[PDB]
Design a protein around this ligand. Structure first.
Ligand SMILES: O=C(NCc1ccc(N2CCCC2)cc1)c1ccc(F)cc1
Length: 296
């Protein structure tokens, strides 16, 4: 069973100081929840994505409500049916990316100090007017599921191997330099769909969320509203302004942080520059496993 060979390719435990209910750090309750949830799903169909990390994430999202989680899994597998996201890496081909990378820079670059894939999103620079000249919202969404599936089947295992421990989550950094009320309305549609996909079909994959170059007001307002969000989803959220450099450098090494954000990592501009790169442990022989290297 080669599927089995794949979960032994990389470290299976989250670090011991990781949040509760994460692989390797389970109390008895959590263990029993997992065993008898896996039962319900295995009962009558469901033979893949029944691994511990997958299920413990769903549960961690529905606060351990085996019943509710059984459904998130069911709705997820139902969406995978329809969207065709198994085999999405085969079918979909985002050929327009070199044309439109500049009008919505999204790119993964290296790892954080805990091994997470770092995900840079310069939403502030967005230009949907130009972007729609060559592509659609539904394609943009497909691409995100492509980058997500690529995160799940390639980036995370190699990050696990390079970090010495399971890595389940990513470190997102959003540059709002250039954002406007105007831009915010034009991306509203897309961000709503992307979030729905993220939260309900990729539970617990957000490990850190940095907003940088946020307007001066916004950062202040969030510190007072903080009590509304869960205390856990506040340890991940960070909201910064003009001077973001070395607050980033506290969670990402200067060797892994791109130069434009203060670090010293750099990419060869002749081969498409930062916006078209995909450097990381998942492109490193030391850490690519029995799954092969990821597509492009
Ligand atoms: O980072 C993840 N979720 C958090 C997130 C979701 C959406 C967005 N935006 C989309 C448009 C605006 C910002 C930013 C972060 C994640 C989700 C699934 C994965 F497999 C890996 C990582």
């Amino acid at each position: 069973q080669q599927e089995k060979e794949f979960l032994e390719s990389y470290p299976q435990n989250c670090p011991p100081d990781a949040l509760p209910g994460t692989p390797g750090n389970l109390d008895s309750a959590q263990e029993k929840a997992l065993a008898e949830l896996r039962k319900l799903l295995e009962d009558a169909g469901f033979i893949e994505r029944l691994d511990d990390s997958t299920l413990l994430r769903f549960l961690r999202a529905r606060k351990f409500d085996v019943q509710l989680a059984k459904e998130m899994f069911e709705n997820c597998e139902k969406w995978r049916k329809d969207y065709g996201t198994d085999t999405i890496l085969q079918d979909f081909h985002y050929d327009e990316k070199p044309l439109i990378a500049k009008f919505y820079p999204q790119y993964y670059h290296k790892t954080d100090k805990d091994g997470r894939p770092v995900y840079f999103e310069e939403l502030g620079a967005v230009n949907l007017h130009e972007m729609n000249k060559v592509t659609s919202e539904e394609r943009m969404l497909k691409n995100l599921v492509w980058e997500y599936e690529s995160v799940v089947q390639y980036r995370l295992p190699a990050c696990s191997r390079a970090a010495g421990h399971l890595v389940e989550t990513s470190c997102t950094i959003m540059d709002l330099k250039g954002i406007s009320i105007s831009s915010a309305y034009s991306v509203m549609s897309y961000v709503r769909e992307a979030s729905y996909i993220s939260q309900n079909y990729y539970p617990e994959r957000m490990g850190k969320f940095y907003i940088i170059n946020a307007p001066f007001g916004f950062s202040t307002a969030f510190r007072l509203f903080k009590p509304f969000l869960d205390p856990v989803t506040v340890s991940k959220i960070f909201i910064l302004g003009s001077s973001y450099q070395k607050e980033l450098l506290k969670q990402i090494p200067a060797e892994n942080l791109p130069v434009k954000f203060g670090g010293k990592s750099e990419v060869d501009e002749s081969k498409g520059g930062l916006y078209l790169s995909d450097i990381g442990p998942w492109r490193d022989p030391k850490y690519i496993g029995p799954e092969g290297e990821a597509p492009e």
